[PDB]
Amino acid sequence: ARGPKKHLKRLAAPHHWLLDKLSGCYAPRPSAGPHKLRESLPLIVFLRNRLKYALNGREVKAILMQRHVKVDGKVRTDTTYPAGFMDVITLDATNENFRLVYDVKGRFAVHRITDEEASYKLGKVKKVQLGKKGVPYVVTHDGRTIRYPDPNIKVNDTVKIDLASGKITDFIKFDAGKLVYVTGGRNLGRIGTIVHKERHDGGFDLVHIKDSLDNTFVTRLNNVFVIGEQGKPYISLPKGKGIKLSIAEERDRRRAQQ
């Protein structure tokens, strides 16, 4: 190609969006934004294929141009705006606030939250560095740069960002015993507690995570997101609480509730 691509085939789209393979030939290409293309949910999919509020792309555009959707407290009018992990989506006219959190299956789940919970979000500290004029700043996972961070904040820590003012309220250090959320790999969407962090200089660090059921799994550090201390998450969790459950029991409880 002689330049950046602008089209996305449905088969090539991220699997977790759950798009019909025969509905059309192309899928919404997320525009540039806070989150990466493969780890983002465009607003069109959320409003049409998840909430079912709109029946087609044009109706989604009509909703957006009416300025009823807010992302992180800001109005967005792009159909393919890349909303992502820990993103707050507010619909005032319908009066709901949603937090984009993966389910156990590995898919963004429609999780409704209260207003007081919608007032803040969490961000994994991807980078800390001194800017121009000797002003420290922190870059989070969603591309937010916050100046004058607390000196104790380091990489791999989590910062509680208030949406209205965009300032850090609290933070969590990355240490053993902390509650973590998996954001990648086939363990995507699971929740557990840190046990040990294995370090390899010049390589990818590995973290051992133990679930509430005592099952243990190892994951690369890049896919780990600290969300609080054990038993005290700073955000409301989706149904299932990030516990992976086998297939036989899946049959079992589906029958039981049925």
Partner RNA sequence: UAUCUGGUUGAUCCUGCCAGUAGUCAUAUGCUUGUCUCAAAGAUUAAGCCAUGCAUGUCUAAGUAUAAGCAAUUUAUACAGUGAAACUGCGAAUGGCUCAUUAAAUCAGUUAUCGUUUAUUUGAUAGUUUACAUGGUAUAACUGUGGUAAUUCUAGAGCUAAUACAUGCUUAAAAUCUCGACCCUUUGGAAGAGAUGUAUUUAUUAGAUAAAAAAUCAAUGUCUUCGGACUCUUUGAUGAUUCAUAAUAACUUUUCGAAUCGCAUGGCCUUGUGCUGGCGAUGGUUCAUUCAAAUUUCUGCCCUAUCAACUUUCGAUGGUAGGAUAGUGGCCUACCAUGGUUUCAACGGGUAACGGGGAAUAAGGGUUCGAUUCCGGAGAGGGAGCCUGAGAAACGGCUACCACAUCCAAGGAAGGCAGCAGGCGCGCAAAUUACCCAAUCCUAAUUCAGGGAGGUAGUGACAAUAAAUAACGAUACAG
Partner RNA sequence: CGGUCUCCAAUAGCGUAUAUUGUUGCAGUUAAAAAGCUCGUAGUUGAACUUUGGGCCCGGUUAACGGGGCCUUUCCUUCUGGCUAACCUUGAGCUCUUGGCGAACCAGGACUUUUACUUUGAAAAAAUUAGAGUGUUCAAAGCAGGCGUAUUGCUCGAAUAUAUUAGCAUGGAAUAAUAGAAUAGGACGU
Closest CA to 122 of 171, 70, 155: 171
CB of 135 vs RNA, minimal distance in Å: 7
Contact 8, 34 (CB under 8 A): no
Q: Considering only residues 192 through 251, tell me which ones interact with RNA, judged by CB under 7 A.
A: 196, 198-204, 206, 217-220, 223, 247, 250-251
From the list other proteins, RNA, none, partner contacted by residue 57 (C-beta under 5 to 8 A by kind): RNA
CB of 38 vs RNA, minimal distance in Å: 7
25 touching RNA, by CB under 7 A: yes
From the list RNA, other proteins, none, partner contacted by residue 245 (C-beta under 5 to 8 A by kind): none
Rg, Å, the chain Cα set? 19
The residues near 135 (Cβ < 8 Å, ≥ 6 apart) are 147, 148
For RNA, what does the binding mask look like between residues 148 and 187, x meaning CB under 7 A?
------xx----------x-----------------xxxx
Q: Which residue, 228 or 238, has its beta carbon nearer to RNA?
A: 238
Task: Determine the Cα–Cα distance for residues 123 and 139; give it in Å rounded to an integer.
Answer: 9
Side-chain half-sphere exposure of 5, counting CA atoms within 13 A: 8
Task: Return the range that interacts with RNA (CB under 7 A); candidates 74-82, 86-94, 111-119, 228-236.
Answer: 74-82
3-state secondary structure 59-89: HHHHHHHCCCEEECCEECCCCCCEEECCCEE
From the list other proteins, RNA, none, partner contacted by residue 248 (C-beta under 5 to 8 A by kind): other proteins
Residue 8 to residues 27, 80, 178, 188: CA-CA distances in angstroms? 6, 12, 39, 24
Q: Considering only residues 222 through 251, tell me which ones interact with other proteins, judged by CB under 8 A.
A: 246-248, 251
24 touching other proteins, by CB under 8 A: yes
- Interface positions with other proteins (CB under 8 A): 10-11, 21-22, 24-25, 246-248, 251
